[PDB]
């Protein structure tokens, strides 16, 4: 399985509502899967959206995802 497919598989695995978009609540469950601190969870997620959410819609689509990789 090529890098390109392991990535697709990861994207689809955390797309819990099946809309082909990753939102911060979905990323949080990926990250969190004692509990980690919410504040650090907020930094990570905020960092991912700052870096990859090119159109600033609060989602990372597949193109934004593939570009981050």
């Amino acid at each position: 399985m090529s890098p390109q497919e392991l990535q697709l598989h990861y994207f689809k695995m955390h797309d819990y509502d099946g809309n082909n978009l990753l939102d911060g609540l979905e990323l949080s469950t990926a990250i969190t899967h004692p509990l980690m601190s919410e504040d650090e969870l907020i930094n990570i997620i905020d960092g991912v959206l700052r870096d990859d959410d090119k159109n600033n819609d609060g989602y990372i689509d597949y193109a934004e995802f593939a570009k981050s990789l």
Partner: protein, 227 residues
Amino acid sequence: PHRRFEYKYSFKGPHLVQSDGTVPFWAHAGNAIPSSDQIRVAPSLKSQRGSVWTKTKAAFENWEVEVTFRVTGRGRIGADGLAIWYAENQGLEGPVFGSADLWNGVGIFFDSFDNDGKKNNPAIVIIGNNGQIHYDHQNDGASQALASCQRDFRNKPYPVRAKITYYQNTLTVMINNGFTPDKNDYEFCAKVENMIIPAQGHFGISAATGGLADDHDVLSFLTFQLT
């Protein structure tokens, strides 16, 4: 108008609760029970209160929230109902559908129980407040209501959906009444032009029961910034 999803002011399933029983980024209180795919904000037991509020304040000029919920009960009559909040302060516990009275900002009240006997319930009532109004329980807020509609949101085959938009100073409430599977069949409910609300607030949701009691469930609370 552009929509930005705001994860930090939102919750939903199918992994809604964390393993310690908390909802990420929200605080819950009273008898609210979070589970993996919904929060039972107040179960169908006597005299219950529960609430769920964002831990931090949002600072959005304009926003839209979509709240998907069920209110379910044996009777053609139920109580007390469910409130959606945008307010300066977290109103975690209190007598207003399970949350604090004398709030500063807006409550959208889904009021199942006809307290003043006017045969006009279930109703949805928008009530602005400035820190000083005591909510008028006995009259279903009738004298304090900026606007209202009649809409039976109880015991529907699909989840009811409230889309609440604050855009260019107007607060609109649209309701999908849950009669069919079409999650976008919204109908107008109410509107308030020139609404002033704090520039920073917590979003919240709460519910309560009395001698009559429905299960009040929120499947999802989804918040968008508009620009």
